[PDB]
């Protein structure tokens, strides 16, 4: 989006050598870089949020709804691993 | 892993103990074991969240994670090891200094910078067991397979070290807005001298104290463990001077009523009930079965509160007694309280028409000894509590009262109530680590009250200056309270006595009528009461004494404030306030354990304990507040112990299975004394919820009924809008083929109930229920996380719906309430810990206006212990019957079928979530338009301010 | 399964149509569901959850028909109600209190009955006594356990040991002479069981503890060698019973002289079981008993002795 | 004291203590002296000498422990800790019936661990403490 990227090296010694050996030195496609430090739940409808917003009427329309006639992780507290953090 | 099958070599907290050293020693052992287990669970949790791993080209361990409770330490060293004192074996002190980078989170930063004296931190040395290309941790695996904790040492914390190495005192936080530079901080620590000795005397070279790499801080509700243990050890070493009237019932010997005022000789037959009674009619009502009569010279047209009551059956004479052919007799004298000010002062007074069972508790709370009052949910236990405080405060103003409470939340509610009573704002003191966040608009902390005294001292001295001007007195009699005191005794008092002489020595045989309007000296002081004197010497002499007590009260107040001119250090001002100025001191039971050693050193003295929520406080933490003062002689000086609580609600949250279930540490002292059949009053008129809702739990209590207004108020007469029945047990069938689910041991969930609760809460919101009035509860900690996650996805993202008032477990919602509760009974295979009737009574008693218990009927309907509640649930449908055309609020009565349309019956979570989708969608414009209108006027009406 | 039988015979939701009472079902369920399964916890928890005691075992209890299986299965369900902990265990007896005195006495006789009960049935009986001695507040139970630990149990002390107690507290001698005449003039048919029970139970424990001696592991005349583990649980439940008797002053006052005079700590501490790894929890219980067995208290007055007083009395003792 | 500046109180205390210590008022003088020692801690050596003269041996012992726990290189009477502690055992071990607050035996054995020049004396001091107490069987044990 912005013409930016970030790299994290496993060690700072790598990062420091990368910094000094690359400091504003040219790369062809980059012309010259600048370097600087630093699921839906089955069968549950999802309510459409109205656009641009982010009490009741005292007469309500009642819709003519009539009944119908493995599972896995959906939420983070269901995940046994994320429950450890 | 204790199942209840085996014997264990543990002590037990049964009803009775052999001796006081037996009692203390069992508490020490079991609390030491439990608190050690709690430390384990916290440290294992934190060390997973810090995610340690070994650096892939070095020996050293580095932390890939982060946790609110811990920071890695940049350096640590022991800076002092003072030689043992005479007659002492361990070093006198062992002081660490630790350096931590606080990191760049402002919320986390405030917590580390508020580590106070006697906070407990663990210095931890740890390594990863696992070296891998990335690493993950699972609570399903044993912690010792993943992380090695090669050492832990606890320490007390002394304060933050400043710019260069001075200890910041507690008062710096109010003035240190010139913040310490940078993100590094240093803290000074006190190591345990006994473990230091043990570490050295065993020989060391790979010395432990170099190895630490984390410091882990516990939360304030568990920091007290070392102070609890320290207290009990001292009482075992010294003479634990429990009151002679009290040690028997703590051990459970003698008659259980040996501490009750019916048996104690020190009970007083004459009691000034103050504003306890609103009217003389209320006195008659408050004592059924007693003859109530006015004393001679009073008439029922004129008998108005206050009243003294004399209970003749507490007198030792025969001449007035329960004599044959006559009832027990109460003599009522109305009291003319001689007012102390000529201004239009409106006295703050009680406005609660206490029921007879509340008055019986108030009466017992004014008498010395042990008073237990069982307070079922919604029965006014807070107002009984405050009335005992206020009556004691007025009947015996030299006495001091210590208030103990399980939670800061209830301690807040109590102080809001007391401030509506006639208690003087300077006599109240509140203490805690909550004092940085008090929600009351008046600050009752040590800092708050010191500033109040300093503020009021100035405005009183302005009245002294104004009074000196009225007396035409010259020279600065208002530089100081001390100057004002000499000015009062020499000048104000002299002139007043010279006025009383001119009245009395002349007298009405040669005083001119209305001359008191002329010879009264302070007329210029009251220059903004017009028509102060009427021109009648009999009345003007009375209002003159009213004016005098107004002036006299000012210099009385000043003479108490003189100490704030001599004591100029901020600390000493709080120590004077804590030991001399305050008469009502309020403190959580947790904080009472921490502050004991300070309070004993300060010579803190108190005469009455009032406890609320006493059934939730541990046996140990209930006992410690008895001993926050030295005995002044061979015996204690405590006069009253009032315990207010309810043993039919949840116990203290002991969480190790064995220490909970085998050693019975889950028994609070309130519950223990009730099992000993100590006399206890039970408040028996609920007022907070529908009679229909109340019926779900008042079967547990003996005679718990409803206040008269529970039948009368429109909110209890009218139905819940859009529900055909004010409560239901809704039988939730399996959702996506799963009933309950269990992603960890003893961590239960049920997505079908969680999705139904979300649609049901959303249904209420489409009906126009306020989100503040609905709270979602569940019995298990697991589902409470899932309900949060469901709502954080499906509600919180939509501003029309919004988040409920609170999503919680039942156990955390103990003592809270809301109008509407959706309760998820997670279990589907076998009945849970909800089989404990104390879980059930709490769970069912949280709603005021509607309770909708989601659950599986077949798991619960067959249980014996739940049957008294389930026979009420069973009389209403298992399917939720809804009236989608009734917007909130409805005018329909709770018991009548609606005529505006036909109800529909929600089959399951699928039908509910499919209905609510169409119901939301179909009403969405009309609901949106109301929000667009409401959000405009909300911002616009404040936009001019 | 339990649920099908429960639905047919006692489950309250079938109260319109469940069968008329059959006593022989109790013998069947106990043999088949409890005893033959070695008291399978799942089975028993389903029985207790299904109101088996409150609907079936106790309302139909008549003492002239109460078999061993009937008395035992009531004990099993109460132990289940107790390990649940959250429950008012003694509730159905506190309602129908009439036959509880006969029931409890029969449970005592089953404890001394040597033949015809499995070791796992004895652990259940002894567990019930730990429970019964623990619930001192329920008066229907307390009026029973109080009879087992009263001054009459000093009939088993040596005359020299009993005399030392009367020197310690003179007024006991007047009380004892009243007891001595009373306990031979009347009610001896009842009172002789009550006063000798714990003395006989101590002996029954000694025999169980001696059955774990390694010399007993030579082949029996039948051929089997019994599994230690149920006998070990009985010994561990017993030291818990002694601790509970010593931890409560009203029992301690009379029982402490019985615990000493019986030398039960010696028989425990010298046993093989203390030395084994299997008895490692037994070892910890005996140390907890040995603490209470000579605690800093004067049992006849309840007075706490001080660290100085206890030390000074020790020096005076050894000097004499 | 309340009325005057704290820096003028030395002109008052020397009269206040001087008045009190001229009379047989030990219970009052104790409470006044422990107030005075908050502003002038140097006077604690004179307070000890007062307490001994008034036979307040149990309080004289406590204040001596405070002087010893204040591990001065030299006190305001020229006595080092190894002198002040020697006073504490002379005052303790000769007064067993009266020294009721301190754990005497824990002091004297802790000396022996520290004052290795005179172990043979301190064992007699500890044993003689019990002999004066007539606890002859503890004397033998020592």
From TrEMBL, chain A:
- Keyword set includes Zinc: yes
Annotated GO molecular function terms are: pre-mRNA binding; U6 snRNA binding; zinc ion binding
Q: What positions belong to coiled-coil segments?
A: none
Key word Zinc present:
yes
Keyword list, A-Z: Cytoplasm, Metal-binding, mRNA processing, mRNA splicing, Nucleus, RNA-binding, Spliceosome, Zinc, Zinc-finger
Give the UniProt entry's GO cellular component terms: nucleus; Prp19 complex; U2-type catalytic step 1 spliceosome; U2-type catalytic step 2 spliceosome
One of its GO biological process terms is: mRNA processing
Q: Where in the cell is it found?
A: Cytoplasm; Nucleus
Spell out the family assignment given in the record's similarity comment.
Answer: Belongs to the SLT11 family.
Q: What is this protein called?
A: Pre-mRNA-splicing factor RBM22
User: What's the source species for this entry?
Assistant: Caenorhabditis elegans
UniProtKB/TrEMBL annotation, chain C:
Which parts form a coiled-coil structure per UniProt?
A: none
RNA helicase aquarius N-terminal domain sequence ranges: 2-320
Localization in the cell:
Nucleus
Instruction: Please give the family membership noted in the entry.
Output: Belongs to the CWF11 family.
The name of this protein is Intron-binding protein aquarius
Q: Which organism is it from?
A: Caenorhabditis elegans
Q: Which residues of the full protein are shown?
A: 20 to 339 of 1467
UniProtKB/TrEMBL annotation, chain D:
Q: Superkingdom of this entry's organism?
A: Eukaryota
Subcellular location(s): the record lists: Nucleus
The record's comment on protein family reads: Belongs to the crooked-neck family.
**Name of the protein this chain belongs to:** Pre-mRNA-splicing factor SYF1
What organism does the record attribute this protein to? Answer: Caenorhabditis elegans
- Gene that encodes the chain: syf-1
Q: Which residues of the full protein are shown?
A: 144 to 285 of 855
């Amino acid at each position: 989006e912005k013409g930016c990227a970030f790299i994290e090296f496993t060690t700072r010694e790598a990062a420091e050598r990368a910094a000094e050996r690359s400091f504003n030195k040219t790369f062809i496609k980059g012309k010259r870089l600048t370097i600087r430090w630093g699921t839906p739940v089955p069968s549950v409808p999802i309510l459409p949020v109205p656009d641009g917003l982010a009490a009741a009427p005292r007469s309500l329309v009642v819709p003519n709804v009539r009944p119908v006639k493995s599972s896995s992780i959906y939420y983070p507290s269901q995940d046994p691993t994320r429950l450890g953090a | 892993n204790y199942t209840g099958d085996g014997v264990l070599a543990l002590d037990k907290l049964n009803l009775q103990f052999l001796t006081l050293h037996d009692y203390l020693l069992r508490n020490f052992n079991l609390f030491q074991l439990e608190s050690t287990y709690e430390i384990r669970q916290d440290l294992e949790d934190v060390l997973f969240r810090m995610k340690p791993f070994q650096h892939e080209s070095r020996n050293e361990t580095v932390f890939s994670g982060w946790a609110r409770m811990a920071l890695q330490i940049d350096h640590f060293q022991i800076s002092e090891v003072a030689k043992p004192l005479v007659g002492e074996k361990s070093p006198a002190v062992v002081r660490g200094v630790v350096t931590v980078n606080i990191g760049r989170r402002q919320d986390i930063r405030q917590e580390w910078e508020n580590l106070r004296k006697h906070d407990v931190c663990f210095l931890v040395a740890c390594r990863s067991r696992k070296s891998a290309s990335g690493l993950k941790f699972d609570v399903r695996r044993p912690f010792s397979e993943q992380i090695e904790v090669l050492s832990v040492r606890g320490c007390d914390v002394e304060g933050m070290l400043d710019q260069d190495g001075h200890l910041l005192e507690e008062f710096t936080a109010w003035e240190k807005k010139a913040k310490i530079p940078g993100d590094l901080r240093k803290f000074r620590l006190l190591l345990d001298p006994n473990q230091y000795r043990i570490d050295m005397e065993q020989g060391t070279k790979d010395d432990i104290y170099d190895t630490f790499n984390l410091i882990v801080r516990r939360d304030s509700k568990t920091n007290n463990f070392k102070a609890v243990l320290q207290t009990i050890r001292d009482l075992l070493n010294t003479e634990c001077v429990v009151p002679d009237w009290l040690t028997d019932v703590i051990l459970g010997y003698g008659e259980p009523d040996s501490a009750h005022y019916s048996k104690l000789s020190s009970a007083v037959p004459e009691l000034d009930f103050n504003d306890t009674f609103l009217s003389f009619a209320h006195v008659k009502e408050s004592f059924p079965g007693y003859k109530i009569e006015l004393a001679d010279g009073f008439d029922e047209k004129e008998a108005v509160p206050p009243f003294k009551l004399e209970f003749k059956e507490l007198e030792r004479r025969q001449d007035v007694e329960i004599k044959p052919g006559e009832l027990r007799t109460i003599l009522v004298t109305p009291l003319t309280r001689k007012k102390v000010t000529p201004y239009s002062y409106d006295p703050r007074k009680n406005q609660v028409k206490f029921t007879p069972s509340q008055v019986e508790a108030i009466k017992s709370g004014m008498q010395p000894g042990l008073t237990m009052v069982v307070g079922p949910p919604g029965t006014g236990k807070t107002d009984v509590a405050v009335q005992i405080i206020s009556n004691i405060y007025h009947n015996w103003p030299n006495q001091r009262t210590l208030i103990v409470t399980h939670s800061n939340q209830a301690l807040n509610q109590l102080f809001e109530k007391i401030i509506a009573l006639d208690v003087d704002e300077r006599h109240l003191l509140r203490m805690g680590h909550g004092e940085e966040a008090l929600e009351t608009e008046k600050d009752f902390s040590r800092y708050g009250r010191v500033n109040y005294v300093l503020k009021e001292r100035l405005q009183l001295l302005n009245c002294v200056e104004k009074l000196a001007k009225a007396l035409k007195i010259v020279g600065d009699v208002a530089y100081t309270c001390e100057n004002a005191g000499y000015f009062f005794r020499f000048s104000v008092c002299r002139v007043w006595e010279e006025f009383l002489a001119k009245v009395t020595s002349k007298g009405c045989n040669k005083l001119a009528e209305g001359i008191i309007s002329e010879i009264f000296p302070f007329t210029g002081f009251f220059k903004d009461i017009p028509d102060l004197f009427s021109g009648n010497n009999s009345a003007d002499l009375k209002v003159a004494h009213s004016c005098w007590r107004h002036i006299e009260q000012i210099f009385e107040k000043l003479d108490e404030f003189r100490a704030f001119e001599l004591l100029r250090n901020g600390r000493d001002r709080t120590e004077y306030l804590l030991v001399k100025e305050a008469k009502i001191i309020a403190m959580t039971c947790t904080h009472a354990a921490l502050r004991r050693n300070e309070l004993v050193k300060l010579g803190f003295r108190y005469d009455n304990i009032v406890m609320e929520e006493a059934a939730q406080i541990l046996e140990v933490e209930t006992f410690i507040p008895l001993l926050l003062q030295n005995p002044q002689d061979g015996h204690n000086r405590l006069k009253r112990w009032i315990m207010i609580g309810d043993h039919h609600q949840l116990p203290p949250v002991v969480q190790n299975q064995a220490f909970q279930k085998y050693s019975n540490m889950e028994q609070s002292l309130f519950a223990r004394l009730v099992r000993l059949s100590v006399p206890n009053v039970q408040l028996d008129r609920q007022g907070r919820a529908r009679a229909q809702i109340a019926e779900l739990y008042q079967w547990r209590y003996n005679g718990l009924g409803n206040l008269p207004h529970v039948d009368g108020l429109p909110q209890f007469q009218n139905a819940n809008a859009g529900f055909a029945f004010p409560f239901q047990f809704i039988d939730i069938p399996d959702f996506n083929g799963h009933g309950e689910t269990q992603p960890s041991p003893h961590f239960y969930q049920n997505l079908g109930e969680a999705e139904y609760a979300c649609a049901l809460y959303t249904y209420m919101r489409i009906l126009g229920y306020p989100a503040e009035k609905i709270s979602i509860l569940t019995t298990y900690n697991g589902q409470a996380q899932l309900i949060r996650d469901v709502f954080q996805r499906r509600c919180d993202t939509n501003p029309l719906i919004g988040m409920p008032a609170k999503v919680s477990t039942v156990d955390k919602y103990q003592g809270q309430q809301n109008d509407f509760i959706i309760l998820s009974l997670v279990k589907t295979r076998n009945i849970g810990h909800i089989r404990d009737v104390r879980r059930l009574v709490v769970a069912l008693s949280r709603a005021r206006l509607g309770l909708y218990v989601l659950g599986r009927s077949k798991v619960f309907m067959d249980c014996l212990e739940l049957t008294p509640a389930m026979r009420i649930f069973a009389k209403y449908p298992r399917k939720l019957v809804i009236l989608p055309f009734e917007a909130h609020p409805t005018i329909r009565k709770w018991n009548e079928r609606s005529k505006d349309g036909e109800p529909m019956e929600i089959q399951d979570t699928l039908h509910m979530t499919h209905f609510v989708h169409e119901f939301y969608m179909s009403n969405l414009p009309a609901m949106r338009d109301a929000y667009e209108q409401a959000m405009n006027e909300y911002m616009e009406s404040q936009r001019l301010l | 399964t339990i649920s099908a039988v429960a639905a047919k015979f006692w489950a309250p939701f079938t109260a319109e149509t469940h069968e008329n009472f059959d006593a022989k079902l109790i013998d069947t369920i106990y043999d088949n569901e409890m005893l033959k399964t070695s008291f399978n916890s799942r089975k028993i928890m389903m029985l207790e959850f299904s109101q088996y005691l409150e609907a079936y075992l106790w309302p139909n209890y008549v003492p002239e028909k109460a078999s061993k299986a009937w008395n035992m299965s009531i004990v099993v369900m109460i132990n289940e109600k107790f390990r649940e902990r959250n429950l008012d265990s003694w509730n159905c007896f506190t309602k129908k209190s009439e036959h509880f005195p006969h029931f409890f006495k029969s449970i005592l006789q089953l404890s001394l009955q040597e033949e015809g009960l499995a070791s796992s049935e004895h652990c259940a009986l002894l567990t019930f006594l730990v429970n019964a001695f623990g619930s001192v507040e329920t008066p229907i139970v307390h009026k029973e356990t109080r009879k087992l630990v009263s001054i009459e149990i000093w009939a088993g002390l040596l005359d020299s040991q009993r005399e030392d107690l009367f020197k310690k507290q003179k007024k006991l001698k007047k009380i004892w002479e009243n007891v001595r005449q009373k306990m031979t003039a009347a009610a001896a048919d009842n009172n002789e069981f009550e006063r000798t029970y714990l003395w006989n139970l101590i002996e029954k424990f000694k025999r169980v503890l001696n059955s774990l001696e390694p010399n007993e592991a030579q082949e029996s005349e039948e051929g089997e060698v019994r599994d230690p583990i149920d006998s070990i649980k009985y010994c561990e439940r017993f030291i818990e019973l002694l601790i509970d008797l010593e931890s409560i002053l009203q029992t301690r006052r009379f029982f402490n002289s019985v615990l000493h005079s019986s030398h039960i700590l010696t028989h425990c501490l010298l046993s093989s079981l203390i030395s084994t790894d299997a008895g490692s929890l037994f070892f910890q219980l005996v140390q907890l008993l040995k603490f209470y067995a000579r605690f800093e208290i004067d049992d006849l007055s309840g007075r706490q002795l001080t660290h100085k007083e206890v030390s000074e009395q020790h020096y005076q003792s050894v000097t004499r | 004291l309340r009325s005057l500046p704290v820096t003028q109180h030395m002109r008052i205390w020397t009269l206040y203590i001087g008045f009190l210590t001229s009379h047989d008022l030990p219970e009052t003088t104790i409470r006044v002296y422990r107030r005075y020692l908050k502003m002038n801690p140097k006077a604690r050596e004179d307070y000890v000498e007062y307490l001994i003269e008034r036979d307040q041996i149990d309080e004289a012992a406590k204040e001596l422990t405070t002087l010893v726990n204040q591990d001065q290189n030299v006190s305001e009477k020229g006595r080092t800790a190894h002198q002040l502690w020697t006073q504490l055992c002379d005052l303790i071990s000769k007064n067993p019936v009266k020294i009721f607050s301190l754990n005497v035996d824990a002091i004297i054995r802790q000396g022996i661990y520290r004052y290795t020049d005179q172990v043979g004396f301190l064992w007699c001091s500890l044993a003689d403490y019990y002999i004066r107490s007539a606890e002859f069987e503890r004397a033998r044990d020592v």
